[PDB]
Each structure stands twice: as C-alpha cells, then as structure tokens.
Amino acid sequence: DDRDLLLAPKWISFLSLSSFLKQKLLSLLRQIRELRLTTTVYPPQDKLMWWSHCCDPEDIKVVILGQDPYHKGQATGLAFSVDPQCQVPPSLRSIFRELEASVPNFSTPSHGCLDSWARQGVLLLNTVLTVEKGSHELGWDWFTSFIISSISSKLEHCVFLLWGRKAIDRTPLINAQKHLVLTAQHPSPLASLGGRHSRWPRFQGCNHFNLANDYLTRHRRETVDWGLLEQ
DNA sequence: AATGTATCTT
DNA sequence: AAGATAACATT
C-alpha cells in the first residue's frame, strides 16, 4: 500500500511511479530504517517527505534545490527550513541576507520556518533526503532526479534555483526551453572558502528571488511573497 | 581572535 | 575517497 511510500497522496498520483520504482523506494526506506538501529539519521522517517505535504505538485511556482539536510539535529524535511523554536543556521542566515539586500519590503524574521513559502508554491528539495549525524552520497539520487524530470515535463513556466555543485549537476534534467534555470554557489559560509576561484556565481548578489518573480510576472503567474513569514 | 559552518584538486 | 583551502558571521 502507497501508505508506506511516505509521499503525500497528490504527489503519489502526480509522479505516477511504476511498481518497480515503488519497490526501489520501499527498499531504500527499509535500508534507512535498518541504519537507524546503528547510527543516527536526519531527518526522522516521518519528516522525510515533509516537502510533499506542504507543496501541491500542480501549484509549484519555484523549485529551490539544495545539497542535503542539516546535520546538527535541525533538519525538518523541507530544505533549509528549521522549527520556529530552533536557531536559524548559517545557510539560512545567508538566504535572509540576500533577501534583505534584494527584495524591497523584506525584513529578516526571528524564526526560520519556510512552511509559508511551500504553501505559496515553493518546493524546497535537496539532492539527497537524509544525512548521517555530524554524508549520504546511499541512493536518493534517482528519486530527486525523478522529481525534477517530472516537474520539468508535466508543469510549464517554473523557476529552478540550483544552489551548490551537487544541485548544479541536475541542470540537464530541466527543459531550459520551458522553464528558467538559475545557478549559484551554496548559501553556506564554507562555499565562500572552497570556490573562491570558482567560475560559478557567488550566492551573495545572485538576486535569484527577484529574478524568479520577474519570470512568473512575465508568464502571467502569481508571484512568491518571500517576506510572508512569522513576525 | 577563536569558532563553526563547500569547492576543487589529487 | 580525502585533504588543502584561509571565507566570514557570529561569538
């Protein structure tokens, strides 16, 4: 039963996975369950497909693609988002800094819960959906690729924000003639250390948020109100 | 000043 | 698979 695939029903329908692939996903989830007896995996099993519960597949406006979940216990299942009682991590600080600098009426919030963006059509996905406490480069690759390939062919006029070189590698999956693809180095401060001589654009000054909104406005779609967050 | 978060090259 | 890099906001 599709209950074991942990995906929200709208997604289980949209993606329309084959029997073969449903068994490949079920085997991976059972492998992660086994791993949890030994080591600690983030996020918890229940919160793996959290991004699928917030965001409806047909409603997607922007696709933000990260590297992998946070590894200090703050991963929520929705990429780069933290719990409202939880302290905003460095990566999320950099995102809020670029929003402050670019978006006109934006003001950085006290809380880091991006649930509001998902309800607005922002898919916060990572290339790998799990992490060992304190890397799972494991076998998620195929599924996150399947999601991107599925969004790119089924939906029209979406924006794909790729951050870091693990995200950038997904570039050939997106149909450039149908959607907008914007690439930048990862928001993490460590991305300013490695890749100081990088040919890829720096996250600081990338202006992805306004650029995405201009594309949506141009294609007569509703914009993302980035500033619509707690406080 | 010390600390805690990728990218590239081998 | 793993080590050098010497960024930078926050503490």
From TrEMBL:
<keyword id="KW-0234">DNA repair</keyword>
<keyword id="KW-0378">Hydrolase</keyword>
<protein>
    <submittedName>
        <fullName>Core gene UL2 family protein</fullName>
    </submittedName>
</protein>
<dbReference type="InterPro" id="IPR002043">
    <property type="entry name" value="UDG_fam1"/>
</dbReference>
<feature type="domain" description="Uracil-DNA glycosylase-like">
    <location>
        <begin position="53"/>
        <end position="216"/>
    </location>
</feature>
<dbReference type="InterPro" id="IPR036895">
    <property type="entry name" value="Uracil-DNA_glycosylase-like_sf"/>
</dbReference>
<keyword id="KW-0227">DNA damage</keyword>
<dbReference type="GO" id="GO:0004844">
    <property type="term" value="F:uracil DNA N-glycosylase activity"/>
</dbReference>
<keyword id="KW-1048">Host nucleus</keyword>
<feature type="active site" description="Proton acceptor">
    <location>
        <position position="68"/>
    </location>
</feature>
<dbReference type="Pfam" id="PF03167">
    <property type="entry name" value="UDG"/>
</dbReference>
<comment type="similarity">
    <text>Belongs to the uracil-DNA glycosylase (UDG) superfamily. UNG family.</text>
</comment>
<dbReference type="GO" id="GO:0097510">
    <property type="term" value="P:base-excision repair, AP site formation via deaminated base removal"/>
</dbReference>
<dbReference type="InterPro" id="IPR018085">
    <property type="entry name" value="Ura-DNA_Glyclase_AS"/>
</dbReference>
<dbReference type="InterPro" id="IPR005122">
    <property type="entry name" value="Uracil-DNA_glycosylase-like"/>
</dbReference>
